[PDB]
Amino acid sequence: EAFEETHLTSLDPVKQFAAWFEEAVQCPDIGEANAMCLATCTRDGKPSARMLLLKGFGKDGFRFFTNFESRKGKELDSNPFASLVFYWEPLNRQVRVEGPVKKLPEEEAECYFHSRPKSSQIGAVVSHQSSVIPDREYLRKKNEELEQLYQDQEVPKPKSWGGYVLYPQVMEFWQGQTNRLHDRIVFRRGLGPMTHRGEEDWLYERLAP
Amino acid sequence: EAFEETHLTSLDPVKQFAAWFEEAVQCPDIGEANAMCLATCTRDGKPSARMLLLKGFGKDGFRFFTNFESRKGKELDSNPFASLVFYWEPLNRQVRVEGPVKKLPEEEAECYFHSRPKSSQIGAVVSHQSSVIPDREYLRKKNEELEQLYQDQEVPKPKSWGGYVLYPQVMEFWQGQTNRLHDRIVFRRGLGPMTHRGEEDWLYERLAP
Ligand SMILES: Cc1cc2nc3c(=O)[nH]c(=O)nc-3n(C[C@H](O)[C@H](O)[C@H](O)COP(=O)(O)O)c2cc1C
Ligand SMILES: Cc1cc2nc3c(=O)[nH]c(=O)nc-3n(C[C@H](O)[C@H](O)[C@H](O)COP(=O)(O)O)c2cc1C
Ligand SMILES: Cc1ncc(COP(=O)(O)O)c(/C=C2\SC(=S)NC2=O)c1O
Ligand SMILES: Cc1ncc(COP(=O)(O)O)c(/C=C2\SC(=S)NC2=O)c1O
Ligand code: NA
Ligand code: NA
Numbered sequence: 001e002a003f004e005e006t007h008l009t010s011l012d013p014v015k016q017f018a019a020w021f022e023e024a025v026q027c028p029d030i031g032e033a034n035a036m037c038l039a040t041c042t043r044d045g046k047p048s049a050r051m052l053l054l055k056g057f058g059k060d061g062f063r064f065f066t067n068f069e070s071r072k073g074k075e076l077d078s079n080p081f082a083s084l085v086f087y088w089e090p091l092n093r094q095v096r097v098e099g100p101v102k103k104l105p106e107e108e109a110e111c112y113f114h115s116r117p118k119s120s121q122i123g124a125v126v127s128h129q130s131s132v133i134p135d136r137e138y139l140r141k142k143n144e145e146l147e148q149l150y151q152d153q154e155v156p157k158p159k160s161w162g163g164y165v166l167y168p169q170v171m172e173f174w175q176g177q178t179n180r181l182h183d184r185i186v187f188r189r190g191l192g193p194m195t196h197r198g199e200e201d202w203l204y205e206r207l208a209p
Numbered sequence: 210e211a212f213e214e215t216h217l218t219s220l221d222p223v224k225q226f227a228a229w230f231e232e233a234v235q236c237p238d239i240g241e242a243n244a245m246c247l248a249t250c251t252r253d254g255k256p257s258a259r260m261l262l263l264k265g266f267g268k269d270g271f272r273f274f275t276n277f278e279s280r281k282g283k284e285l286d287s288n289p290f291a292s293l294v295f296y297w298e299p300l301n302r303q304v305r306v307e308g309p310v311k312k313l314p315e316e317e318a319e320c321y322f323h324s325r326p327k328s329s330q331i332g333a334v335v336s337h338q339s340s341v342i343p344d345r346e347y348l349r350k351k352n353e354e355l356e357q358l359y360q361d362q363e364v365p366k367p368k369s370w371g372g373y374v375l376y377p378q379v380m381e382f383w384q385g386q387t388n389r390l391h392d393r394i395v396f397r398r399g400l401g402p403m404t405h406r407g408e409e410d411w412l413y414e415r416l417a418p
């Protein structure tokens with residue numbers, strides 16, 4: 001029940017994420033363990049947030065796919081900094097990740113896009129994500145028309161559709177407790193008596209709940 | 210299964226929130242229907258996000274309680290704009306709220322604070338939220354000491370502990386669909402052929418998914 005510095009799986013917070021993520025995936029009361037909230041903002045400090053799915057992770061960071069012309073994509077292109085929240089209610093656990101964002105190479109975005117179901121590919125060609133549209137019939141009609149156009153052909157990836165990778169600068173591991181005296185172990189890239197060395201350029205510290 | 214403009218419960222998006230919130234509360238597969246992700250950022254555009262609990266809502270906005278000296282509280286005091294995400298996975302629904310934030314009156318914060326369990330009150334006096342601390346024993350020791358100090362007495366609310374209210378400027382209602390052709394009905398305070406009048410100064414529009 002205690003979450004303690006001496007029982008970390010790893011002092012590389014990406015590997016500690018992998019350990020917790022695996023526990024979430026193994027939990028039958030968790031539906032999408034890779035659902036996350038992505039927080040973005042304008043350069044002038046106006047924040048926004050939405051659910052997204054994590055599509056891959058490792059040393060270079062946390063990957064996701066979206067339309068670059070969406071509201072989030074205009075913010076990320078103008079202000080390439082973001083934060084992620086993973087919340088696993090049945091495990092009483094939260095993971096926060098903060099870092100800069102860059103676009104994935106076009107070739108990786110093409111490969112990912114053509115791995116999706118064909119109906120989802122056509123949906124991305126239909127949708128100018130976050131633009132105002134008249135009604136839901138507009139989507140249904142254009143979808144049906146593109147189904148006809150792409151019968152027995154490859155669906156081209158929209159130029160505006162692709163991926164981002166968030167390179168972690170801060171990773172917080174949160175475990176809920178009674179009385180709201182939660183356990184918080186927070187890794188940051190970088191020594192005071194409360195600051196500890198992790199792997200590579202990582203440091204970690206406990207934060208008050 | 211369709212989420213349609215002609216079947217909105219209300220064109221006052223606070224009342225539409227109330228209708229969806231009630232459905233979530235009625236759903237036995239949802240634990241904390243009032244859990245939400247709060248997104249904040251610095252004036253210079255560095256975003257952050259964390260889970261919080263909604264503690265009340267109505268026409269003046271969405272209320273929550275926290276330590277003003279925390280990381281979120283320093284951002285909100287310097288840059289009084291935020292965004293909220295509600296995600297109800299078993300209902301395939303998301304609600305986003307964007308708006309300015311101000312502090313609740315001290316008298317309301319006192320009333321709320323003394324309605325909490327006494328062990329949670331003492332926990333808030335223990336914790337300088339988001340400050341670096343040496344270890345979890347530091348929390349356990351100080352908690353036990355304050356339990357002794359406040360035996361048979363009232364726990365004073367910390368000066369730094371209180372509430373905020375987010376006054377809604379934008380409210381998005383999202384309903385997931387097959388093929389990722391989701392339904393998005395977004396209310397904003399304010400007419401083009403795709404913009405519709407709601408109650409008071411509200412307008413609403415459908416956004417592409
Ligand atoms: C669980 C979940 C996962 C989602 N995953 C994605 C995704 O990977 N990419 C995406 O573009 N939208 C995804 N969405 C939809 C977004 O929440 C959002 O509606 C969309 O990206 C537009 O956001 P924006 O207007 O802030 O740009 C997902 C929604 C849910 C509820
Ligand atoms: C479901 C859930 C609800 C929470 N509710 C609150 C809350 O209402 N107030 C709060 O200060 N922290 C709450 N927390 C803890 C926060 O996620 C976070 O650790 C804390 O507020 C510090 O955030 P900051 O360092 O960004 O300021 C909650 C966490 C979870 C998982
Ligand atoms: C540090 C901290 N302070 C305040 C509150 C607000 O709730 P309350 O006033 O203690 O009920 C919470 C709330 C939590 S944590 C969790 S899991 N579920 C919640 O509702 C918190 O974590
Ligand atoms: C508009 C939009 N584009 C892209 C993706 C990414 O997932 P995929 O590539 O379609 O599997 C999603 C993902 C969703 S929505 C939901 S509920 N669960 C998801 O994983 C999306 O909503
Ligand atoms: Na580095
Ligand atoms: Na107004």
